[PDB]
Structure formats: C-alpha cells, structure tokens
Write a protein that binds this ligand. Structure first.
Ligand SMILES: *[C@@H]1O[C@H](CO)[C@@H](O[C@@H]2O[C@H](CO)[C@@H](O[C@@H]3O[C@H](CO[C@H]4O[C@H](CO)[C@@H](O)[C@H](O)[C@@H]4O)[C@@H](O)[C@H](O[C@H]4O[C@H](CO)[C@@H](O)[C@H](O)[C@@H]4O)[C@@H]3O)[C@H](O)[C@H]2NC(C)=O)[C@H](O)[C@H]1NC(C)=O
Ligand SMILES: *[C@@H]1O[C@H](CO)[C@@H](O[C@@H]2O[C@H](CO)[C@@H](O[C@@H]3O[C@H](CO)[C@@H](O)[C@H](O)[C@@H]3O)[C@H](O)[C@H]2NC(C)=O)[C@H](O)[C@H]1NC(C)=O
Ligand SMILES: *[C@@H]1O[C@H](CO)[C@@H](O)[C@H](O)[C@H]1NC(C)=O
Ligand SMILES: *[C@@H]1O[C@H](CO)[C@@H](O)[C@H](O)[C@H]1NC(C)=O
Ligand SMILES: *[C@@H]1O[C@H](CO)[C@@H](O)[C@H](O)[C@H]1NC(C)=O
Ligand SMILES: *[C@@H]1O[C@H](CO)[C@@H](O)[C@H](O)[C@H]1NC(C)=O
Lengths: 422, 120, 104, 129, 120, 436, 120, 438
C-alpha cells in the first residue's frame, strides 16, 4: 500500500568532526583573516559533552601550529649557550648583568658583550658564584620571538564549513554534559580570546545567572574543576622597571635583543587584586562547591610545589611573561592583595621536547589590567582545593563547553501513499 | 530558520525543505581540503539523486514498496507523532538497504526505456 | 465586448447637454473608452479610460462608468460636440458600440 | 506631433487584396505602441480590423476578417501596411489608422494598452467592381 | 570562435551560447586553488540556475513579467540593435532585483508542485 | 489587451568584466621548470575595450612571480657566511679592478683551517683598515650572501602567461596604441605572446619591436616623476664581451659546500665592454626625438647621463652569459637635438659578483664566475627615460636614462593585455512565458 | 562487469551502458590533484551532455544527420561487425566536428523553443 | 539511407593515459599508503580483447620510483644531521682483521664552550684513511656529502602496497602467464588496484617478489643489444637466510641541543662475520632451469655465470636491507659456473655491514643507519634475478652473464610489467535510424 518517497532538505544531523575555519573581527589577525545568524530550535534536546568536544582539540592544535609557524623565520639563540659571567644588579640577585664572549656577524671577530638576564633564565655552571648558562640551552633550541610579531590574544570565531553547523546550548546553568533542552544553531562561535594562563582564566566569558562549577566527575578527584564566574575580578599587573632595549648583533642581520640598562630603581613586578571582590568571589565559589561536596569544610591551599610553570599564575601581561605567587588568594578555610611576580624570558609553552622561546625585553614600564572570569581547581570531613588544572585544553573548554559541531544530512526517506507513477 | 523545523513533526517539517536544501555551497592545504570536501559532498548528493530518479526535486516518489520489516507503523504516528531525527534513528539500520532498492528501481526503469529504443 | 448604445439620440440644445450612454456585454474594470466621431474627421478619442478625459480632450465630459454601464456628459453642448459619441471595448476583440449620434 | 499618415490603393478589382499603408509620420515604427487598422462600413458601424505590436512584433486581427487578415510593419520603411485577402465589394469601407501608445501602468504586464490617440486623416477603399 | 559574437547583436549572439559555455570548464598550490576556484564558479552558476529552475538549459524562460522600468526599449532595439555587453551595462542596477524575482517565482512554482496533495 | 514580456535566462552570454585572478605559465633552467605547461586568437569584430597598461595587474603578478621564482631557486644552495673574514688582497693586474685575495677558511673537514685564494672584483669588496691590504665582502656583515646554484640557469626564455578557465585575456591590436584608453581592434587569447623576463635598468633587451613606428608611452607626459617607455620599431644590436679567459677553481668550505672563484686568468687582463653601432644608435636617437617632439612641442631635447653615482642606479646593468655587467651608458645619452638635424660606440663595463636585484633586506646573491671568455649579442628594443623637473618656462627639456622598479620592463611587454572574467549568465525580455 | 562488453559488438555492448555509467557517475598536493581531476572529469561530462540536451540519458538521439564522409559503412556492419573501440578509432578525426554540430543543433532547438508561439 | 547521430554514454572504450595513482594498503609505507584496500578486490575478464603492453615504457614504474625517492627524502628531513662528526678519528681495531673499529674523536657538544672526547664504533666500509698515520681516519664521504641520521622512530621495512587508479581510469592486467613483457596480450582483465607489491630495495637478486605461475620467464627489452637488463622471474623461490650474529648494544652521543647520534656501545661475546645461507641444491636447480630458458634466446651457445667486472661494493655486491641494517654480500659463489645444457639432474656468502649509504646516488647526500642492538636474522625469498650479458662475444660460442642490472626501476618493472593505466572514454556517437523528433 505504501511506497518509499525521498525527501531532500530534511532537518536532521549527526555528530561529526571536521576542520573549522577561523574568522577574526599580529599572528591572530593574519591567521584568522576571514571576516565575520542564530536560529533557536524549539522542542530539540541535544546531548553535549564538553570533555569530548573536538573543537577544543582543534583549537589546541591551531594554537600550537600558529605559534610554531610564527617562530620559524626568527633568530635562533644558539651562539649564546656559552659560559656567562654574571654579576648582581640589585631582590638582590633577581636580575643579573652577564658578560660573555660571542662571535659577531664578522667571522673570527669575537666580542665581549653584556646582556641582562633574570635569575629564572640562568643556571649555575661552576661553584665560583659567577659562571652561569642559559636555562636548558644544552638540551633545547631557544628561538627569539620576532619583535614585529605580536601574540596578543584577540577575539576569534570558529566557523563551520558548508554542510556542517554548530549547535549551541542556551541553558545558562548547563553543567557541560548531558541533554540540553534549549538548543540553537549558529555558523560561528562567539569571540574567544586565546589567553594563556595556568591557574586563573583571564579575559573570558562570564556566567549570566550564577557561578557554574563544571567537572567531568566531581567524585573522581583526578579531574580539573572549571569554575566560571558570573562577575569578573579585576587584576592590575605591572612591571615597574623602566628598561631600555639594546640590540646585540650575533650574525649577518641576525640580532639578539636584551636590556641595555634600567633607569631608576629596580622594583618587583606585582599584581593587585581587590581584597573585597576576591573575598566575595571566593565565598560564592564555596557556596557552589558545597552543593557537590555537601556538609564539608572547604579549604583553599597553594599548589604542592615545583617549577613556576606549574605552581605559579603564569600569564602574558604586555609581552612579558609573569609568574605570580597566588598563595595569598588560595589560603583560607570556609565553613588590596598584592601578588609578587617574577619575569622569565626563556619559556617552553606546551612542554615541547628540545624547543624553547626567548621573549625579548620591552623597554619602558609594563602595565596591564585583566578580568578574572574563572578558576581551575583540583581537589586533593574537609575538602582541600588547590589552584591549577590540566594542560591548556582546560582554558578553552571553559569557552567551547556550549558548542558542538554536527554534519547536516538533508536526504532521507519515508513511506507515503503515492508511487512513482511513471 | 535553518533547522527550525527540527523539533516539528515530519508532516510539518517536510513543508520547509528549501530552507535546508539550499545551504550546502549556498545552494593552505587545509583550506583546499575543506573546499574540495564541500564540493565533493555537494556532488555526492547530486550523484546519488541522479542515480535515483529524483533529479532536481525536493519531494519525489519511487516505485519501491514499503517493507513492514523496516517500520510496521502506519502513516498516522509517523507523520504527526515523530520528528525526522527520531524517524532517521528508527530506520537507520535499513537506510543503505532502502537506498540500494531505490537504485535498483531506477535501473529497471532505465531498462524499460532501453527496451523502448531497441534498434533505435 | 458586444457593447451597444443606450442613448438613441442626444441632439441637445446649447448649454444643456444630454448624456451619451451605452452598456457593455459584461462588466469589466475600466477596459472601455469614448471617441468623438466628428463628420469628415477621424474618430479621435474623447475619454481614454472609464470616461476619464483623454489627453488634450479639450472637453469637460466625464462619468463614473461603473461596471458595464458607460456614459459621458460635459453638461454643456457646443459646436465642438457635433460628432457621434461612440464607446468601445478595450478587452478581447476591440469591438465598437453603436454611436450615440449626438450631433450636438 | 506623432501623427499617423494613412494611404490606400483605393480602386481595386473585386476579390483583390485590400492593399493599404500607414506611415509613422514624426514617429518610429519600432516603438512602445500598438499600431492598428480599423474601418467604417459605409458609416453603418465602426469596427477594428487588425493590430500589430511594434514593441514585440506581435499581431492580432478581428474575427470578421479571420483567415483573410494581414498586417506588417517595418522600421526601415518607418511604416505599417496591410493587405487583407478577398476584399469583396462588402470590404469597400473607409480605412482608418491609429496608434495606441503603451504605458508602464501597474497592470502586471510590461505595458498596458491605451485608447487610440494618434489618428490618421484616413483613406477610403473602393473594392467594388 | 570564443567570444566571437561579443560584438554581435543579442539575437545573433544568442546562437553561440555553447561556445562560451564549454570554455567555463576547459579553456603549485596557487594553481590548484585556481582550478578549485574555477570549479566553484561553475557550480555557483549551476546552483543559481538550479534555484531558478533552469538546470540543463541554455535558454530558460520564466514566469516573471518584464518591468518597463528596467528597460523600455522594444525587442527589435534589443535583439537586433544592441549587443550583450551594452545590455548588461544598461540593466546592471536591476540585475540582482531580477534574480531575486526569478527565485521567488520558482518558490511559488515549487509550492504549486510539492504541496498539491496530502503527503504527496 | 496587454503587452506581456517575460524574463528569459541565457547561459553562455559573450560578456565579461575586469577581474584579477591567478595566471599560470607555459613555455616550449628556472623558467623551463617553473613554466612547465606545454604551449587560438579570436578577433572580436565591433568590440571596443578600455586598456590601461599602468593599472594592469598582470605586471604586478609577473613581478611577484619573478621574485618568488628567483628566491626559491637560491634556497637549496651554498651560503657564503664562512667567507665573511678579513681578506688580504693584492692587485691581480684596470689598475686594481680585479684583486687576488687570500684568507684563512675552515675547509670541508671540521676543526681544520686552510689558507685559500680567491679572485674578487673591486665592486664586491670594501676596505676595512688603513693598511691598503685588508678587505671584506661588500655587505657580508649585514646580510646573508647565497651562492647561485652552479647547475641552475637563469637565462630568460620566452614564457606565456595563461588565464584559467572561466577567464580570458584581451589583446589590443592597434599597432600605435599608447597603452591607455579605448582600443577598437580587440582579440581574445588564452595565453600571452612569448615574453622574455630580461632584467635590465635602462635599455630593454630582447623585447618586442613596434610594427609601424617608434611608440613613446607615459602615464601623463607632464609629470616628471613618471617613466617614459620608448618602444622601438627597429632594434639596435649591442655586443657585450668579457674578454678575460678565466680558469675556474672550486674550493670547499663545508660538507659538500663548494665556493666557486676564478683560479687564474690566462693571457692578459682586459676591460669588459659593449659595442653598439654608432650609425644605428644615432638614427635611433633621431627618430626618438622626432617622436618626443610631438608631446613636447617646439622644445630642444637633450640627453644626459643619470645622477646618483651608485652603479646600480646610473649604469646599464644586465645578465650576459651568467655574469652581471654594469656598463657606462654616458656615450649613448650625451647629446643635444633641436629637431632640424637630419639622420662603433664602446661602453666600458664592470663585473659585479655580489648582487641584490630586488633590494632584499639582509639578503644577497653571489654569481659564481664562468670560465673561458664571455660574449653575448642582445637587441635593444626600447628605452626607459625620465625627465628632469625645474625646466618650466625654458625651451629645453632634459631626458635621462632610467625608470622605477623592474615593473617598467615587464610593463613594456604586457601593455597590450588585460585579464577579464567571463559572466556567462544574463537575462533579457522576450514574448514567451514559461509553459507551466 | 565493468568494461566486460568491450570485446562485444556495438549492438551487444550498447545494452550494458548502465554497467560503466554506474561506476563513472559514482565518486597533500598529490591527493588533492587526484580529487580535483576526478571532479573536473565528472563536471565536464555532465556539462557536455547538458549542452547536448542529453541530461539523464544513456542513449540520446539528435537531429544531426550522419555524414557519409565520417563513415560510409551501413548500420548492419557498424552495429554487428564492430566493437566500440574500433568504431571510435575509425571516426576519431571527426569526433570534435560531430560534437560541435550537436551543440549547434541543441542551441538552435532551445532558441526555436522561444520563437514557437504554440509553446509560449 | 537517412541516418542520424546518436549519443551513447557509458561505452566500453578507453585510451592509453598517464595519471597520478594513489597508494592503498591493508612506518613510512603504512603512513603514506593510508587508504584502505578493497576487502574483496574485483577483476573483470575482457573477452575478445587484445591489448598491447610494454613493461619498459610503463609510467607506473616511473611513478613508483618517484614515490620511493619522495618518501625517503621526506622521512629524512626531521632528523639529526651528522655534520659535527666530520672530524679526524683515532680508530683502533676491535678484532676480518679490523672490519669493525673503535674510533674516538674530539667533538663540540651542545655547549659551545666545551668539547668532549667521544667514542663510537664504525665499519671499515664507512671509514677512509686520510694520512700515513695508521690510526687517523674520517667518514667515507663526510667532506663531499651531508650525512643525515635516520630517525630511530621511522621504519622503512617494505610492506605490500597497491597502486590504485582514480575514478575515471582503470588498470588493465595481462593474464598470459608466459607473457614476455611487450607486444599484444590476448587475455586481458580490468582491475582498479594492482596486487600487493613490496618496495624491496636490492641490487642483484629480487627478494620477496612475485613468482611466475608456469615457468621461469626471462624478459629483456632487446636480447641482442647488450645494453639492456635481463629480468629473470622465477617460478619457485629460493630461501636466503641472512644473519648478523654480533650481539650489540646502543649508545647515544649528544652532539647538539637535542641532536643525538646513535652508535654501538659495547659488543657482547665474540665478533663474527655477517653472512647469508642459500641452499646449494635449490640454487643449482635454479641455475639449471635459468640456463634452459636462456638457451632459447641464445641458441647453441655455452652459458657462463661470472661475478661483475669490478668497482664499488654498491655495484659488485648484493645489497639489501635486513632488519634495518644494510648488508653487502659477496654473491660470487652463486654466479661462478659454466653450463652446456646437458647437465641433467649450504652456500654461505660473506657479508659486510655499511652504516653510511647513498641510495639512488644522490649528489651531496648520504644517510646514516643507526646500529640495532642484539642480533639480526632475516629469511627472504629470492624470486628473480637481474642479469647483464657482456658484449663482444658475437664471434664465440659462449655467452657471459653477470649479476646486476640498471637502476632501481628494474626491480619494480618485474612486478608492474603486467599492468597499464588507461583512461575511460564513456561518451561516443554512432549513426542510427531514429531522429530526435522533438
Ligand atoms: C638576448 O638573447 C641572446 C640570444 O638570443 C642572449 O645571448 C645568448 O646567451 C646564451 C646564454 O648566455 C648563449 O648560449 C651560451 O653560449 C655559450 C657559447 O656558445 C658557443 O660555443 C658553444 C660551444 O659548445 C657552441 O655550441 C655554440 O654554438 C657557440 O659557438 C655556451 O658555452 C653556453 O653553454 C653553457 O650554458 C648552457 C646552458 O644551457 C649549458 O648547457 C652548457 O653546458 C654551458 O654551461 C650557452 O650555450 C648564446 O650563445 C647567446 N647568443 C648570442 C647570439 O650571443 C642574450 O644574453 C640575451 N640578452 C639578455 C640581456 O638576456
Ligand atoms: C560587425 O558589424 C557589422 C556592421 O557594421 C556586421 O555586419 C552586419 O550584419 C548585419 C546582420 O547582423 C547585416 O544586416 C543584415 O543584412 C541583410 C542583408 O541581406 C538583411 O537581409 C538583414 O535583414 C540585416 O539587415 C548588415 O548588413 C551587416 N553589415 C555589413 C556592413 O556587413 C558584422 O556582422 C558585425 N560583426 C559581428 C561579429 O557580429
Ligand atoms: C584596576 O584598575 C582599574 C582601572 O583600570 C580600576 O577600576 C580597578 O579598581 C583596579 N583594581 C585594583 C584591584 O586595583
Ligand atoms: C620603422 O622602421 C623602418 C625600417 O623598417 C624605418 O625606416 C622607420 O624610420 C622606422 N620608423 C620610425 C618612426 O623611426
Ligand atoms: C654585433 O654582432 C652581430 C653578429 O652577431 C653583427 O651583425 C653586428 O653588426 C654587431 N654589432 C656591433 C655594434 O658590433
Ligand atoms: C632458511 O630458513 C627457513 C626457515 O626460516 C628454512 O626453511 C630454510 O631451509 C632455510 N634455508 C637455508 C638455506 O638454510
């Protein structure tokens, strides 16, 4: 009685992974060159899983690829892996004046050059308290970032190619996993800033109704807990030292940039967080944490200890990489804050084997002001929480948690009363 | 809007096919792969419709009878009590089978047309 | 389109014009016009559509010309009106009605 | 003044073609206007005879002539012409010529027909023999 | 020859449409991009003809009336007295408007073809 | 009673619009490899089109393509960084044009120094001390000098630029076309004629000749900052010789990295030069001033050498046999014409091995010497001239050789072509409705 | 099987066209070039059939008369004594000529379709 | 008659064409040949079809060659260069009589201010003396070429691969089991993919290839030119068991910031020579049958097998990759015989190991193969031979055949000889009696 009828344009989709293109509205402006809507789907329930979202894996790969490509046509700091005769400028040893014998652009002409290095960028060689070497230069290649290439995070949008669409969850309190009952279709994500940090999430999006605490499994205690704030906390960071940049020529048009001198006094870099705003934010965080860990004491402690890359608050302020001591923020029991910071010029983001980047110094003074929009916490009748999560993916899941990519399948079949009627 | 009828019943969703049908193609190495793949998806759908008799049609009927083994529900409780997502899930194990039968039907029609051109 | 005159004659006295009138085979939206078939002259149009005055008509003649009932009157006769006032269809075949033969 | 300028063969053998012409005086033959022939049946009645649409080289004719109707026009000549077949004595009517300008009215058509406004002085047929 | 009729009138030039049509497909990474782009332009035009209901045709009539505001010239002064370059320039400001009307007409035609019967 | 016309869609309409796209390259060596496509003109009757040789994106694409190919060709080859050392140079013979320079360089085996000798031209070395013996390479302390690949030929060959499908190239067939404005004889081609990518600074060599007369083209002819391109209708032969019979040696500076230099010169040392026939040049200048007087009415035309000093700015440079010659053109552009005058020249040349053809920052290329003697014969097919400003309100115009960047040479062959995109769709009225 | 009729006569082989059509009409730099070429060949064959008025057909008659210059052999020998390989080799020099005539005929037919008052 | 042109789409017509083939397979080869194969490949036999083949003009061989060169070059780019090791070595014999040497050298390490005295073990074939001091040596070609260390994480082991035509193209196969590689073939079938071909690299004997199905087939472009390689395809394989008995350890020397050179640390037990064992009776029978087939082309002549005339081991020894090591075996006990045609009826070949090799004779390049610890054993199937016949023997009754062919293409023609790529031309026209008729 019934016959097969083919319908093209059927409003169905299936989960799929594809390559999304980047559209901006500098490495990011150049890469995300495509210039930059929302259809609400009634009676549509869609399962989301922010920890299985391949948009995060693509974003991670895109950040690493863009940084790696940007540093290829730049100065490789291999002739500087020599003994450094370093003397204190001052604190009292944080910044040293290092003298070394380096062959310049003319072969057979060796010069005695001076450069300024931070304590964290050098390692002792001998027991004479004067001979230092660049950190990890014997096991890795240190590439100087090109001063004309900016890595400043800007808003970018990830957009699906034709034939694919991005589904967005409009439930303001969605926990990152399971069915979402208010789903809409978009072509591009909101503007996401690829901000790099290790403990606090800066310049991200805020929750609109409440602080939302998301975890793959709140009873596992091996998972990162992502806390999305509904109100930001301003963090004002500065490097008060007034530096003047100097250029050391190490090859035929290949120059190493350092600090020629510091004008005025040497002062410690620091970040200022309002005490009242932090205390209220932390109280609200505890109020939400007690919903998952009921009738427990909530204690915030500093991380277990180790290299600043994993136990300090790392961020790029104004081209310099700050490593701030966040202990004053995570030292409390629940039932102005000035954070000292160190500056490190030789860094290894994403823990690559055999590679490192040198950030050249910026003359003058540095000031920046960022919005703290979320936290990464790890859980150790008292619950112990410490700052810090997993790798960089945790800083992007917090933005991509509401999106999934699906493939559109417009072709389908159904029975009806009519036949081909040739 | 695009996929706006996704939560609607099949009977209502089938009345807005132009909205979704015209979205694919609006009708360095990674960029070329994405462009080539989008073109290939467009052509794959046009080729599949060309194999079938449904060339240039949003809704087209066939001569393949409906098999009660694929779904034993009647038109009531399919077109007015199910969405297309639920329908596609319900018969997903038979989608390729149905597609092959559709092709076979068109091939038989071609044979009849070929028979009508014997020595012609 | 098989219109015919209603005004069998209209040889009105000066400044006391009688109306021309005709009726269509069927009602239409406009699709009709009047012309002045003056003696020894071309029957130049008098009212281009629905008794609306023709360009350079140089006459006061007008009417509502509702439905199939067409008419035209200037409310004043003159030597210029000494012509047969004819109406015609402007749909299907352009059939002409008998003229009113006003000759006023 | 885009006047029509009618002409005719006048005297003719019975059952001859009703040859006639009408120049597009001070006007283009190829224009957004419909050119038409009409005749007066010895003043007993007026009737349309034929028309041709210069805008698209279209043509139509009255059922009274039917198969005998003919119409043509040319831009090179800047004139319209006609020659209806079998012009018997009954066809010895006065021959009128007029152009009905086309207008871009909201007619759901490229242009609507107007009432004929530009009329020729005309010429009479004498097809009886 | 290719574009040989470019200086010809629209009427005469309409008799060589296959000459220009063939040259759209047959006529390091940068050259692969050039080939992909040529394919994309071809498909763009085919999709545009598709939504207009003109697939597979060189000359395709529509049901959209011509508006005298776009051009009030007679057909003889278009097909026999003007070239296609002059025509495309003359109505350039209305090209997108005309295209939209064509699509709208086809959409109405689709409604009159696919929604005539219940579920058929 | 209505006049009804309908829209009809026509696909394959012979219309086009100006467009910029990627062009490919065909040819019958860097150019044979790059222009790998193996190598059809339709005259368009009653077609008038607007051309503008100074807004032609084919020139910009040719410029970028030449620079990209040149730079790519030099990547997999020997860098000369180890040679940026103090050189102990003594005059080889002129009076010091070629020097025999000794230096201490690490050889193909590491941690082993070898004293080596090499032959350098005066233009390639700079004094670095007051001892009259210590020299350094002209720019090695600020740039990377890459040795040209000894097995890669840069000799220009005819190439053809071709449009992709969906595009076409329109050619202007007006033999006296001035490069801008309407052209009434237009033909459609898929590929351009064979263009040789010859690199020169003042005279255009091995180009195309005008078919009827000398054609002088300029964007304005009133703006002294614009280049005047003079296309000749008859070529002038220029025979350039490098008479020194060089014996080449190859010294290794790394694991398979060989530096090529002249090992010895057999016979005497003689000056490189170019020979231009005096009568042909004098006739060429006569006809050029006859055409220039049409744009600069009742003016005296004086040719002078250009200013600037630097050989790369004021001398005529070219690649002859693989060597880069810089010739003194003063004898060609030192004359006064008043319009009433009816109607061998040996140009001395220098050789420069370290060049930077497109003024790249931090980069340079070293042309290795070629042994034996070098001879070439080129055809002068056009000139680049500029005018001096400050000559308003006087009766004499001053013209000097030279122009802008390399685009003016490439613009001298592509001036008659433009790329257009084909727009196969169009609509038109007709009295025929869709039968539905 | 695919090309199984290659050694068969033209008559016998023309009854199996669906066997080859079903394979030809279905489906870093090196792989992209292979994909682009496959797309270009598909689109070129579809365009050529479209401009011949043969869309969707395996056997498509035309209004172009056969010229004895191309082949003066009778149908009995062409269809029962020859294979398609031999036939295509025999008329290779005239294939492009034949194609151009087909295109001219199809274009004229479409033009004729807009001058036909009965069909308008 | 009144005949009309009719268009037929899908005609079984093809023409010779050269296109890009893609690689499929069921490691550089597993990564490159990422496309899966057909789990049940189809083949259609074309009856009454005669097709000309020419194995010496087959562009599938040229493409296979280019793909081998491309993958080896790409696979050696992200790896350690050995330029820092081109220094004078102080080498002392470990043992033969000095085949393996313990070489010490002064090399600048990742810190530019310090030099270390490192020790490494090298084979005699990789070390060249440069002085009259018996202990002073350098690497065989470090002053003329750039030696790149192969990455230890990248395997080059040959695996079966299939070359597949893109849509619109097909591969024709010759099913004549005794086809000589050229001319018409009357049993032709159509396939989409070739059989599994292993990209095995060797210089004299073809290993792990396909066997003939009915008899030994000897193919040559022209048997009388003496400038063409004779490819002998066996119908029964001969097992060759190759061993490197030294039990080695691996040591890592740091020569730069993350650039590790791998060499042999210690050798455990006694030093013994690498060798290959070929069964004597099977080889003797193989040579007998080869002579029987060769006598069909060289009628009434004596066939003598000799070793190649001389030169570098790359051209006079049997070279192969066994376990990742490159063996150069003295195949002189296999090709040292005289046969007259009436001869009705363990061979241990010494082998050398060479760590620095230059495959395909690339100018200015070389590869270093890191040593593999433990012992290496391989068992390969000899499936064919490359022979060259000496010229100048036209006036004598004896022909001289020596092992070794031309370049590497000869090792792949032996597998691709039965395939050709064609383009499908589905659109044809023919006269009929039926007109368009609107
Ligand atoms: C304008 O155009 C002219 C040509 O129209 C160019 O001049 C030609 O330049 C080329 C390249 O410099 C010259 O070709 C070279 O000639 C050398 C000498 O040739 C003589 O000797 C050889 C000996 O075998 C004879 O065969 C030959 O007939 C001559 O008698 C050769 O030695 C060169 O060979 C070298 O380069 C080639 C590159 O392919 C290699 O294969 C060789 O191994 C070797 O390295 C080369 O053949 C040509 O002779 C010149 N022509 C004239 C007429 O002089 C101008 O340079 C060009 N102008 C500009 C500005 O570019
Ligand atoms: C380029 O322009 C010339 C005109 O300058 C074109 O030639 C002209 O073509 C038209 C037809 O398009 C000819 O008109 C026709 O003439 C015949 C003569 O019998 C007539 O019967 C037709 O009704 C029509 O009037 C015209 O005479 C002819 N002119 C000349 C001087 O040859 C030419 O075809 C154009 N080129 C291209 C490529 O189109
Ligand atoms: C940070 O600076 C902003 C102004 O940029 C100010 O409004 C805010 O209160 C400051 N916060 C702290 C903690 O100092
Ligand atoms: C063009 O060339 C001829 C020789 O072919 C020459 O006589 C004539 O003078 C040249 N034209 C000009 C303007 O110099
Ligand atoms: C240049 O050489 C050519 C032959 O190659 C000769 O005909 C010409 O006269 C010479 N010209 C000069 C100026 O020496
Ligand atoms: C080689 O080893 C195999 C087993 O791996 C054995 O069958 C064969 O006989 C051996 N060959 C020789 C020549 O010893």
């Amino acid at each position: 009685e019934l016959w097969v009828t083919v319908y093209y344009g059927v409003p169905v989709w299936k989960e799929a992974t594809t390559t999304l293109f980047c559209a901006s509205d500098n490495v990011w402006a150049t890469h995300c060159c495509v210039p930059t809507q929302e259809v609400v789907l009634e009676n549509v329930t869609e399962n989301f899983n922010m920890w299985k979202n391949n948009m995060v894996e693509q974003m991670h790969e895109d950040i690493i690829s863009l940084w790696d490509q940007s540093l290829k046509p730049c100065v490789k700091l291999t002739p500087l892996c020599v003994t450094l005769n370093c003397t204190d400028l001052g604190e009292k040893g944080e910044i040293k004046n290092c003298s070394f014998n380096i062959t310049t652009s003319v072969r057979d002409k060796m010069q005695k050059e001076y450069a300024t290095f931070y304590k964290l960028d050098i390692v002792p060689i001998d027991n004479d308290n004067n001979s230092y070497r660049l950190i990890n230069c014997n096991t890795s290649v240190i590439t100087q970032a090109c001063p004309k290439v900016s890595f400043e995070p800007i808003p970018i949008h990830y957009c699906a190619p034709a034939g694919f669409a991005i589904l967005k969850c409009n439930n303001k309190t969605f926990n990152g996993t399971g069915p979402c009952t208010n789903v809409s279709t978009v072509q591009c994500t909101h503007g996401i800033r690829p901000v790099v940090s290790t403990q606090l999430l800066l310049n991200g999006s805020l929750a609109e109704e409440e602080i939302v605490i998301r975890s793959e499994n709140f009873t596992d205690n091996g998972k990162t807990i992502i806390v999305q704030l509904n109100e930001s906390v301003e963090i004002n960071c500065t490097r008060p030292n007034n530096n003047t940049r100097k250029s050391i020529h190490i090859g035929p048009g290949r120059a190493f940039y350092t600090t020629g001198q510091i004008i005025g006094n040497i002062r410690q870099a620091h970040c200022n967080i309002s005490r009242a705003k932090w205390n209220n934010t932390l109280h609200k965080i505890v109020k939400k944490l007690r919903e998952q860990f009921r009738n427990k004491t909530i204690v915030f402690k500093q991380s277990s200890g180790g290299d600043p890359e994993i136990v300090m608050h790392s961020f790029n302020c104004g081209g310099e990489f700050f490593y701030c001591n966040s202990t004053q923020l995570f030292n409390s029991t629940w039932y102005n804050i000035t954070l000292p910071c160190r500056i490190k010029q030789i860094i290894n983001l994403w823990q690559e084997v055999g590679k490192a980047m040198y950030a050249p110094p910026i003359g003058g003074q540095i000031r920046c002001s960022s919005n703290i929009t979320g936290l990464l916490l790890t859980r150790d009748t008292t619950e112990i929480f410490r700052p810090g999560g997993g790798d960089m993916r945790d800083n992007w899941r917090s933005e991509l948690y509401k999106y999934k990519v699906v493939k559109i399948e417009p072709l389908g079949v159904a029975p009806t009363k009519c036949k081909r009627r040739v | 809007g695009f996929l706006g009828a996704a939560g609607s019943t099949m009977g209502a969703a089938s009345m807005t096919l132009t909205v979704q049908a015209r979205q694919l193609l609006s009708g360095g190495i990674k960029q070329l792969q994405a462009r080539v793949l989008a073109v290939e998806h467009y052509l794959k759908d046009q080729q599949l419709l060309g194999i079938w008799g449904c060339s240039g049609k949003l809704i087209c009927t066939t001569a393949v009878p409906w098999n009660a083994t694929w779904s034993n529900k009647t038109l009531d409780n399919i077109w007015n009590n199910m969405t297309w997502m639920e329908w596609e899930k319900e018969i997903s194990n038979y989608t390729n089978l149905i597609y092959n039968l559709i092709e076979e039907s068109q091939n038989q029609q071609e044979k009849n047309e070929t028979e009508n051109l014997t020595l012609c | 389109x098989x219109x015919x005159x209603x005004x069998x004659x209209x040889x009105x006295x000066x400044x006391x014009x009688x109306x021309x009138x005709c009726x269509x085979x069927x009602x239409x939206x406009x699709x009709x016009x009047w012309x002045x078939x003056x003696x020894x002259x071309x029957x130049x149009x008098x009212x281009x559509x629905x008794x609306x005055x023709x360009x350079x008509x140089x006459x006061x003649x007008x009417x509502x010309x509702x439905x199939x009932x067409x008419x035209x009157x200037x409310x004043x006769x003159x030597x210029x009106x000494x012509x047969x006032x004819x109406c015609x269809x402007x749909x299907x075949x352009x059939x002409f009605x008998x003229x009113x033969x006003x000759x006023x």
